Design a protein around this ligand. Sequence first.
Ligand SMILES: *[C@@H]1O[C@H](CO)[C@@H](O[C@@H]2O[C@H](CO)[C@@H](O)[C@H](O)[C@H]2NC(C)=O)[C@H](O)[C@H]1NC(C)=O
Ligand SMILES: *[C@@H]1O[C@H](CO)[C@@H](O[C@@H]2O[C@H](CO)[C@@H](O)[C@H](O)[C@H]2NC(C)=O)[C@H](O)[C@H]1NC(C)=O
Ligand SMILES: [Ca+2]
Ligand SMILES: [Cl-]
Ligand SMILES: [Cl-]
Length: 331
Amino acid sequence: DYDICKSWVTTDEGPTWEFYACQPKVMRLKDYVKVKVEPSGITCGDPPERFCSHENPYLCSNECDASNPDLAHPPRLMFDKEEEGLATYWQSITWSRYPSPLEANITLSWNKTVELTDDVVMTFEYGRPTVMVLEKSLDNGRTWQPYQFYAEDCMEAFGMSARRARDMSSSSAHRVLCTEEYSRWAGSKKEKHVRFEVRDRFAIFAGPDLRNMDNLYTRLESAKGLKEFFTLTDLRMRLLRPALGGTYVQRENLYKYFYAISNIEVIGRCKCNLHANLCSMREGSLQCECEHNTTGPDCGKCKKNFRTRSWRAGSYLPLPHGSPNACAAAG
Ligand SMILES: *[C@@H]1O[C@H](CO)[C@@H](O[C@@H]2O[C@H](CO)[C@@H](O)[C@H](O)[C@H]2NC(C)=O)[C@H](O)[C@H]1NC(C)=O
Ligand SMILES: *[C@@H]1O[C@H](CO)[C@@H](O[C@@H]2O[C@H](CO)[C@@H](O)[C@H](O)[C@H]2NC(C)=O)[C@H](O)[C@H]1NC(C)=O
Ligand SMILES: [Ca+2]
Ligand SMILES: [Cl-]
Ligand SMILES: [Cl-]
């Protein structure tokens, strides 16, 4: 939708461009991400360390060794292409420091404003976390805010009630919530995925089958905060407690507790303020290819000779084609 920024047509005075509101295509945003995993030393394998392989097989004699490619689990394995039968994953050290918390931050950076268009799916291989917060930034990691909380027990963990995104109403579609859906029981079901529900929130407007896109586009234009809720320059997974298998920690086998993430899927498009339908790597980071006489990485300002009036974003409205709201040169 909103696929073309400009057309070359002929009116009298002859040939001229006509402009339309436009946006770039949805991308596999994990293919563009830069990752940081903290604190120092959290990645397994330096020094080599064994862990239990859910087999378990009671022995627990598998090894993570950062020095051997066959046995190493660096952060880039969270984003790779996987062939059938061969999940690859980042892996933390085991909880050998228990009762000290086992905590890891995974920061996902684009150095570019992007808009999610489907769920964020974070897939864990030996148990999802019992407690984690997904945070985002809109200013390249200068400030952070909570995006969704996750806990086996939302009250105990964060003083929050247990909710679900699909339970939110039109006025609460951008509300930050705590959910127990991906964390209560973690370690025992082998469900693997923790989600940040985007599609459920779009459904608040577009219906359960997402067929009423007209109403979602209208709300995205008009509801303050709605489009921004889906926008970010960075996400951070603040992992606070690993899977427990819905039972108490077995102190004599700390080798079964660890985080292992095989894939983080982030799907969405560059934010171009309805002024670009292409966004591409330039000077090492994504930037919109701005149309409508705009400029800046998100088409958020007017080009130097086109400053006769204030910059505006393009609009989705009126439906179906919206409005380009292009910058204007004098006269
Ligand atoms: C994960 O990221 C948060 C956010 O930066 C870290 O928070 C800092 O932690 C210490 C307490 O441990 C505070 O003194 C700082 O003020 C915190 N900064 C902020 C902005 O909150 C947290 O330490 C990180 N977790 C891990 C395990 O590294
Ligand atoms: C983040 O992205 C911006 C592009 O949007 C990069 O900014 C450019 O940096 C190059 C090389 O340093 C300069 O020649 C350009 O003039 C800069 N452009 C702008 C708009 O400032 C920036 O380096 C990237 N930052 C990081 C940390 O990767
Ligand atoms: Ca992988
Ligand atoms: Cl901009
Ligand atoms: Cl300027």
